[PDB]
Scaffold this active site. Structure first.
Site, short mmCIF file in Angstrom:
data_model
loop_
_atom_site.label_atom_id
_atom_site.label_comp_id
_atom_site.label_asym_id
_atom_site.label_seq_id
_atom_site.Cartn_x
_atom_site.Cartn_y
_atom_site.Cartn_z
N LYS C 41 12.10 26.77 31.82
CA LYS C 41 12.86 25.87 32.67
C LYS C 41 14.29 25.85 32.22
CE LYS C 41 9.86 24.17 35.44
NZ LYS C 41 8.71 24.14 34.57
N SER C 272 -0.36 26.74 29.70
CA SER C 272 0.03 27.50 30.88
C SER C 272 0.23 28.97 30.57
CB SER C 272 1.29 26.90 31.49
OG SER C 272 2.32 26.92 30.53
#
Lengths: 123, 96, 313
Positions: C41, C272
């Site tokens: 991110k 993830s």
């Protein structure tokens, strides 16, 4: 016989003001012998992997009288059994297969059909 | 235009609205964060599995009542989807 | 040489590492924890503010606001600190003390909302903050902001192309906002014309809304444990026209595969990351993918989750 007799109190020791809903719930049913556990309590104890071994006899009798026993929805008990790991069927390995038989003879089901399939892939 | 055991399912929605406690949701979220409540045996309590069960009952009973042309049944349906929305709104986007 | 003018300009150029003990040797992992705030991110925290500057909306006195309980909050915090912006993050009160400390240390202002209202309560409060002075506050909107996939079309995609000399055959990415998958696909398929590329979205089995969307089914999300992906809706930054295939991963496949990455590959990995790799392994049991080059996104490092159940043995 009760869950306290089989596994003792598996709660992290803490005061009830510091306990989660499942920790609280477990202290409410731990002294309740298996034969009288409500259907709601039975499903949840299975889902939460609480000595499933010794619960099979009780499950076997609840379903014979009502194969879609459940509190939140019909078929909930079968849904809970869907979550069993075969390896924890120690001495009741035999009682399980008796249940699978009753379950493999039905007509009306839906998203339950995969659970009934998932039950049959545990050994 | 008249009910049958859709009755037995309108009752189950409303009394399932004593399984939507704040701490039932907050336990689900902390499970999502990877902080489930540990047991002493080893392993964890699974609060998000209880929430999945609650969603399943509500979703199932709302389907039962979805197309029932009856006012009492449509009221219970709105309550079931208000509760489903209540749960979905808490989780959607969480952790991102 | 290269001297970066602030930390936001250090994003990207993350390594592509071959997995040797996991799979057949053709899984290539792009380690996006090699980033200024140690997640993928970081890229969108930078470019979303760069874009806001380029659009002129971000001006003297204008402050940033976003609702996020995840890595976007960390990414926006370090960029705003690097470039002198005031940031307010709205987020549920379930967020840990340690996560609050990390953000406050990066200068972010925190607004904690009622826990049972979950993420919508955090979204609502951010919208009420911007409504209190829309000229002062600006909402980044990570799920819809096209600056999100833009940076993956400009950076992440090109890096994969250059590093693989165009021989990437499958691209696998878990979907949170959809930006990574969208931009990387959009560059390789559009800009470089490799329409052969198979783009794989990864989502949880317990909240499989992308698979539901492509079947025309009604969207029925649920809780899952693969933190970072699995939003429970199809975000605007997910372009479904580019998704060739979607693989659902179970909670337990993601945990163990993440732990395999750490113990078998020496790559610190979150859930993830284990899920995206688990999807590559599932693709490789189909023999049609046995000899293809598979590039997988690894979005964050396991050390960020050192307190979680990821570390249980």
């Amino acid at each position: 016989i009760t869950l306290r007799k089989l596994i003792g109190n598996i709660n992290m020791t803490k005061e009830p003001e510091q306990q989660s809903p499942l920790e609280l719930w477990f202290e409410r049913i731990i002294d309740v012998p298996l034969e009288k556990l409500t259907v709601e309590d039975l499903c949840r104890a299975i889902r939460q992997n609480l000595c499933i071994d010794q619960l099979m006899p009780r499950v076997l009798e609840v379903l014979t009288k009502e194969p879609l026993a459940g509190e939140y929805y019909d078929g909930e008990l079968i849904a809970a059994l869907s979550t069993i790991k075969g390896e924890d069927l120690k001495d009741q390995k035999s009682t399980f297969t008796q249940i699978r038989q009753l379950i493999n003879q039905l007509e009306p089901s839906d998203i339950n059909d995969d659970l009934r399939k998932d039950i049959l892939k545990i050994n | 235009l008249n009910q049958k055991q859709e009755s037995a399912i309108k009752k189950i929605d409303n009394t399932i609205k004593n399984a939507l406690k704040d701490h039932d949701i907050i336990g689900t979220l902390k499970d999502m964060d990877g902080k489930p409540v540990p047991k002493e045996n080893g392993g964890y309590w699974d609060h998000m599995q209880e929430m999945q069960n609650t969603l399943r009952g509500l979703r199932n009973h709302a389907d039962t009542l979805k197309n029932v042309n009856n006012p009492e049944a449509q009221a219970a349906y709105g309550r079931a989807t208000d509760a489903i929305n209540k749960i979905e709104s808490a989780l959607k986007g969480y952790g991102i | 040489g290269k001297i970066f003018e602030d930390n936001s300009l250090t994003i990207g150029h993350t390594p592509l590492v071959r997995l040797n003990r996991i799979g057949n040797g053709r899984i290539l992992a792009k380690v996006e924890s090699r980033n200024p705030s140690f997640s993928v991110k970081c890229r969108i925290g930078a470019n979303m503010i760069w874009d806001a500057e380029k659009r002129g909306v971000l001006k003297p006195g204008v402050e940033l606001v976003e609702p996020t309980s995840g890595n976007t909050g960390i990414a926006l915090a370090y960029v705003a600190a690097a470039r002198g912006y005031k940031l307010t993050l709205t987020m549920p009160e379930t967020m840990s003390i340690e996560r609050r400390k990390l953000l406050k240390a990066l200068g972010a202002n925190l607004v904690l909302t009622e826990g049972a209202k979950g993420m919508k309560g955090a979204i609502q409060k951010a919208e009420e903050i911007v409504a209190s002075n829309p000229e002062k506050y600006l909402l980044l909107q990570q799920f819809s902001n096209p600056a999100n996939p833009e940076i993956h079309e400009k950076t992440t995609g090109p890096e994969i192309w250059e590093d693989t000399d165009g021989q990437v055959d499958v691209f696998i990415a878990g979907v949170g906002t959809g930006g990574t998958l969208t931009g990387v696909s959009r560059y390789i398929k559009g800009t470089k014309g490799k329409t052969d590329l198979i783009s794989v979205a990864v989502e949880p089995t317990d909240s499989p809304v992308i698979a539901q969307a492509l079947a025309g089914e009604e969207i029925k999300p649920g809780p899952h444990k693969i933190q970072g992906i699995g939003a429970g809706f199809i975000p605007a930054n997910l372009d479904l026209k580019l998704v060739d295939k979607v693989i659902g991963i179970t909670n337990e496949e993601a945990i163990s595969t993440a732990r395999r990455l750490m113990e078998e590959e020496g790559i610190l990995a979150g859930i993830s990351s284990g899920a995206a790799v688990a999807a590559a392994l599932k693709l490789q049991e189909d023999e049609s993918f046995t000899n293809k080059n598979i590039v997988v996104i690894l979005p964050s490092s396991g050390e960020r989750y050192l307190s979680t159940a990821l570390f249980a043995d």
